[PDB]
Amino acid sequence: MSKKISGGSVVEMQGDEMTRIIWELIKEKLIFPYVELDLHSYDLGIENRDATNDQVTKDAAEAIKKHNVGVKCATITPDEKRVEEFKLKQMWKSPNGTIRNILGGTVFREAIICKNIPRLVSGWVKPIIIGHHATDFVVPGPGKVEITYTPSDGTQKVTYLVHNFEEGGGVAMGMYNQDKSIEDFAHSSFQMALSKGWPLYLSTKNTILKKYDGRFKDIFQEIYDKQYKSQFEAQKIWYEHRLIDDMVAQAMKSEGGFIWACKNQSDSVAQGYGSLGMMTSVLVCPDGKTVEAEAAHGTVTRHYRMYQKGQETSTNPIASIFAWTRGLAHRAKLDNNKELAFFANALEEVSIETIEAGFMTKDLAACIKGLPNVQRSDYLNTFEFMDKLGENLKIKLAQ
Amino acid sequence: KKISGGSVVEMQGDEMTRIIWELIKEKLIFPYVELDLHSYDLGIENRDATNDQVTKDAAEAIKKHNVGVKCATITPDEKRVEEFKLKQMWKSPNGTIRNILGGTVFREAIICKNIPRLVSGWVKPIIIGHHARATDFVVPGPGKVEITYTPSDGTQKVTYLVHNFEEGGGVAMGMYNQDKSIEDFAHSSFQMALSKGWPLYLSTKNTILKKYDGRFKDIFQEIYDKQYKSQFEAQKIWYEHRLIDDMVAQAMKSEGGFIWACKNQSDSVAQGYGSLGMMTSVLVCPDGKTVEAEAAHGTVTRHYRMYQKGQETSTNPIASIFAWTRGLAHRAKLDNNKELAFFANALEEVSIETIEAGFMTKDLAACIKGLPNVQRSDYLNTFEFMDKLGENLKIKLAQA
Numbered sequence: 173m174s175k176k177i178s179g180g181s182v183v184e185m186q187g188d189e190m191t192r193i194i195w196e197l198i199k200e201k202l203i204f205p206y207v208e209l210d211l212h213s214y215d216l217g218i219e220n221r222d223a224t225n226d227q228v229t230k231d232a233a234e235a236i237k238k239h240n241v242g243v244k245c246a247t248i249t250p251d252e253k254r255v256e257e258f259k260l261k262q263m264w265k266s267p268n269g270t271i272r273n274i275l276g277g278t279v280f281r282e283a284i285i286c287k288n289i290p291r292l293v294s295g296w297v298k299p300i301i302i303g304h305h306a307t308d309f310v311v312p313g314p315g316k317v318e319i320t321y322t323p324s325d326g327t328q329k330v331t332y333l334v335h336n337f338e339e340g341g342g343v344a345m346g347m348y349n350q351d352k353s354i355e356d357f358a359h360s361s362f363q364m365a366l367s368k369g370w371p372l373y374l375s376t377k378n379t380i381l382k383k384y385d386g387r388f389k390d391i392f393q394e395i396y397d398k399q400y401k402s403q404f405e406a407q408k409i410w411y412e413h414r415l416i417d418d419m420v421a422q423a424m425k426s427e428g429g430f431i432w433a434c435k436n437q438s439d440s441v442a443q444g445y446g447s448l449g450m451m452t453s454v455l456v457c458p459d460g461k462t463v464e465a466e467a468a469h470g471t472v473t474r475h476y477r478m479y480q481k482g483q484e485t486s487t488n489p490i491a492s493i494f495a496w497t498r499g500l501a502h503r504a505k506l507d508n509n510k511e512l513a514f515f516a517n518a519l520e521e522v523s524i525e526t527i528e529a530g531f532m533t534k535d536l537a538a539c540i541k542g543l544p545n546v547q548r549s550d551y552l553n554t555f556e557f558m559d560k561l562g563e564n565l566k567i568k569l570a571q
Numbered sequence: 572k573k574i575s576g577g578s579v580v581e582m583q584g585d586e587m588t589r590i591i592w593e594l595i596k597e598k599l600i601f602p603y604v605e606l607d608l609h610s611y612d613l614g615i616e617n618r619d620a621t622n623d624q625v626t627k628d629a630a631e632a633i634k635k636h637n638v639g640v641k642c643a644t645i646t647p648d649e650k651r652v653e654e655f656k657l658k659q660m661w662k663s664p665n666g667t668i669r670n671i672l673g674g675t676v677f678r679e680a681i682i683c684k685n686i687p688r689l690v691s692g693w694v695k696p697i698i699i700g701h702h703a704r705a706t707d708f709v710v711p712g713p714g715k716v717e718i719t720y721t722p723s724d725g726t727q728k729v730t731y732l733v734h735n736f737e738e739g740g741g742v743a744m745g746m747y748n749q750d751k752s753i754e755d756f757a758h759s760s761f762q763m764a765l766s767k768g769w770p771l772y773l774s775t776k777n778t779i780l781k782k783y784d785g786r787f788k789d790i791f792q793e794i795y796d797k798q799y800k801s802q803f804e805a806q807k808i809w810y811e812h813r814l815i816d817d818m819v820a821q822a823m824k825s826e827g828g829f830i831w832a833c834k835n836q837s838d839s840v841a842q843g844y845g846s847l848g849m850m851t852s853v854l855v856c857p858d859g860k861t862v863e864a865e866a867a868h869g870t871v872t873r874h875y876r877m878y879q880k881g882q883e884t885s886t887n888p889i890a891s892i893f894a895w896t897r898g899l900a901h902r903a904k905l906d907n908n909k910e911l912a913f914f915a916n917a918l919e920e921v922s923i924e925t926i927e928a929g930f931m932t933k934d935l936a937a938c939i940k941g942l943p944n945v946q947r948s949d950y951l952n953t954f955e956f957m958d959k960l961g962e963n964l965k966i967k968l969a970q971a
């Protein structure tokens with residue numbers, strides 16, 4: 173009489189402040205009632221990180237590498253103010269940084285689209301997934317600036333002229349990129365495309381940077397033809413290179429539903445549009461097995477201060493919920509678990525349908541009709557909305 | 572009696588824009604304004620016939636007379652050489668003119684209240700100014716890549732480590748920027764701000780590129796404080812530096828009506844939104860006298876192929892029209908010609924009012940209600956729309 177799904181091995185990381193409260197509600201109301209998990213829980217709360225000297229963060233990373241699926245709640249990155257607040261032993265490095273450094277791979281951002289919530293481009297009815305991949309100095313006066321390559325094998329040194337400053341000074345800088353980095357970026361991008369069953373596009377400026385950006389185009393094409401092209405044709409999808417100039421135009425005339433590898437912020441645009449609560453951030457390792465899913469937003473400290481004073485809050489849980497669904501969706505693919513695959517999709521649909529039915533948090537109401545025009549009847553508080561998702565999920569899974 | 576416009580350099584172009592350019596002169600300009608007109612045909616056939624000498628003459632003419640208005644021109648590729656049997660693959664006329672005149676290119680969208688915007692909050696235009704290469708190469712295998720500065724005065728040579736390749740190969744490149752280039756970019760940006768009476772913003776990444784982007788921030792601030800700050804305070808406007816991260820957020824929460832100097836594309840976004848016909852591109856020289864105005868779009872080849880087959884076309888002339896109005900507006904400022912200044916503004920108002928009244932080309936109708944939902948009664952063809960502007964301009968100028 174359990175009735176629940178066998179989810180398998182999932183690494184879970186608890187976080188800080190407002191997201192921590194929402195994270196517990198998601199597990200209690202949306203996940204645990206329907207899914208049984210071999211759950212590897214790690215508390216990346218600031219207090220426990222301080223208590224363990226950030227050893228919990230390193231253990232969490234090694235656990236993700238072993239079990240292949242990670243879902244992470246937003247965490248506090250210590251600054252000077254945070255050290256004084258919690259009396260921290262040290263100004264600990266960003267947990268995200270530590271995890272990224274150990275796992276590696278490419279970060280991919282995906283917005284959640286609802287038909288009753290406006291978009292930057294109204295034509296975009298399906299999400300677009302964006303994947304992102306120096307020594308500068310002042311030239312005091314006239315002189316020759318050159319960039320030189322000295323081979324490790326002790327063969328002849330090669331020299332290239334950057335610019336000869338004949339009158340006056342200016343600035344100069346050198347950039348670089350290793351082949352291994354570009355290969356990893358390509359693999360991750362192809363893995364993501366097959367995982368989602370959408371076509372992939374790489375954008376560069378290879379007309380201008382014929383060698384530098386040319387290397388990106390070449391390495392992508394080589395790896396595609398030799399390893400991935402057959403698997404893409406099997407799912408009726410494709411990979412193509414585009415010039416950034418053409419890609420922007422094509423992307424905006426498109427209706428979305430494709431992967432975009434970008435050689436070059438996505439967050440700033442989301443902040444400007446006020447849609448941080450509706451964007452997820454998945455780290456995809458190039459091995460094709462390991463994945464770490466989380467919200468693109470932080471711990472929402474401002475909202476937490478109101479919660480601490482016992483005031484009503486309306487914090488958007490969709491980004492946090494979709495971190496779970498993307499993680500479980502990947503678990504389902506690795507294990508060929510069609511029951512879990514269905515649940516992951518079902519929860520995503522319930523979430524969108526609930527907002528499309530008119531039930532949403534304050535940020536979404538403000539997005540529709542502007543923040544000044546929002547009244548209390550236009551939206552639900554953090555707990556009311558989670559309850560409404562809970563009721564709608566029970567009905568969908570019963571059907 | 573018509574208006575005495577003065578000295579204006581005019582450059583005829585190619586394909587669809589060439590047809591619209593002639594209609595603008597015939598219907599909107601010549602009936603009301605007399606010009607000491609310096610006409611140069613930068614049509615691909617005449618450029619080929621003169622071995623691109625007409626393009627160089629056009630540039631020298633703009634430098635002499637200070638005001639240029641240019642129709643969109645074909646930039647030869649391999650396909651164009653075969654089409655016109657060209658003697659050589661001639662360089663972009665825009666490139667030749669920019670190389671001779673110099674200065675910074677500024678793009679400005681035309682805003683109508685009944686035409687949607689990327690950001691609905693934007694009710695006034697935003698003017699984007701870009702700065703304008705690099706030495707890139709392949710790193711075949713492991714080794715040390717360094718960038719070195721050897722002073723011409725024979726003082727100590729300085730060496731910086733770019734990257735030590737330990738495990739494999741990759742790519743590396745060197746970029747530069749001269750002080751004079753940054754100074755010209757600053758001057759042009761301050762001139763544009765005062766000309767429009769709007770505040771200016773420079774965006775950089777000086778948190779990461781502390782030296783390279785730092786130089787931009789410093790040179791802008793120096794030139795502002797010493798030459799421009801007093802003149803800005805006189806018009807109740809200001810200049811401030813911003814981090815690109817903050818500037819994007821601020822810009823999108825803003826209602827527009829400011830100059831944006833960008834050190835990190837505008838055309839691609841316009842193409843994607845289908846509003847290329849509503850964006851102008853003015854080259855502002857740092858001397859404050861010389862200006863070259865044109866549409867941000869090309870010759871609209873796709874539309875021209877339909878015209879050649881005798882099919883109906885709906886090509887937006889607003890960008891091309893505003894090239895003329897911005898040119899004549901600058902002429903009017905240089906010559907203290909209030910009669911021409913009024914006409915330039917009057918034509919701009921007529922253009923916006925006509926679209927706001929419901930009379931527009933197919934691109935604008937498609938922008939409102941989506942291309943699939945557009946019917947023939949929703950828009951006017953290229954010639955119908957030009958006729959409607961002509962009638963509305965006559966009425967507006969009669970009232971005054």
Ligand SMILES: NC(=O)C1=CN([C@@H]2O[C@H](COP(=O)(O)OP(=O)(O)OC[C@H]3O[C@@H](n4cnc5c(N)ncnc54)[C@H](OP(=O)(O)O)[C@@H]3O)[C@@H](O)[C@H]2O)C=CC1
Pocket residue numbers: 245246247248249250268448449466467468469470471472473474475486487488489491535
């Ligand atoms: N991945 C991670 O763990 C990240 C870590 N952080 C950490 O987060 C903490 C706080 O950073 P802060 O910039 O304030 O956090 P956010 O990135 O959450 O931004 C704060 C503001 O964004 C809006 N917002 C963000 N998410 C939501 C949501 N789900 N629902 C509604 N509104 C939302 C709110 O605007 P409004 O006030 O108008 O409602 C809120 O005040 C810091 O300690 C920082 O280090 C930050 C970024 C990412």
Ligand SMILES: NC(=O)C1=CN([C@@H]2O[C@H](COP(=O)(O)OP(=O)(O)OC[C@H]3O[C@@H](n4cnc5c(N)ncnc54)[C@H](OP(=O)(O)O)[C@@H]3O)[C@@H](O)[C@H]2O)C=CC1
Pocket residue numbers: 642643644645646647665842847848865866867868869870871872873874885886887888890934
């Ligand atoms: N300054 C200059 O002189 C420039 C020169 N060119 C030249 O232009 C030629 C063609 O360039 P191309 O790539 O087609 O770019 P264009 O900008 O000329 O046209 C591209 C597309 O943009 C839309 N568009 C552009 N202008 C208008 C308008 N006034 N009204 C309505 N829609 C418009 C149309 O989309 P849709 O097809 O959907 O209607 C059009 O097919 C080339 O020979 C190129 O060298 C290009 C750019 C700059």
Ligand SMILES: *CCS(=O)(=O)NC1CCN(c2ccc([C@H](C)Nc3ncc(F)c(N4C(=O)OC[C@@H]4C(C)C)n3)cc2)CC1
Pocket residue numbers: 281282283285290291292293296298299300301302428432433434435436437438441442445447
């Ligand atoms: C890589 C080239 S870049 O550096 O110039 N990035 C810019 C171009 C693309 N862009 C952008 C596109 C898509 C997203 C997010 C991840 N996906 C998304 N899909 C559909 C969708 F409708 C939306 N949004 C939307 O329409 O408005 C809200 C939301 C986005 C814009 C916050 N997003 C992010 C960034 C802009 C940067």
Ligand SMILES: *CCS(=O)(=O)NC1CCN(c2ccc([C@H](C)Nc3ncc(F)c(N4C(=O)OC[C@@H]4C(C)C)n3)cc2)CC1
Pocket residue numbers: 678679680682687688689690693695696697698699827831832833834835836837840841842844846850
């Ligand atoms: C310099 C930094 S960048 O390289 O990232 N440029 C991007 C950020 C700004 N941006 C942009 C802004 C403004 C314009 C045009 C020149 N001006 C403009 N003002 C008001 C306005 F409403 C519009 N448009 C609009 O809302 O939708 C149509 C039209 C634009 C978006 C085609 N434009 C161009 C580009 C994006 C690139």
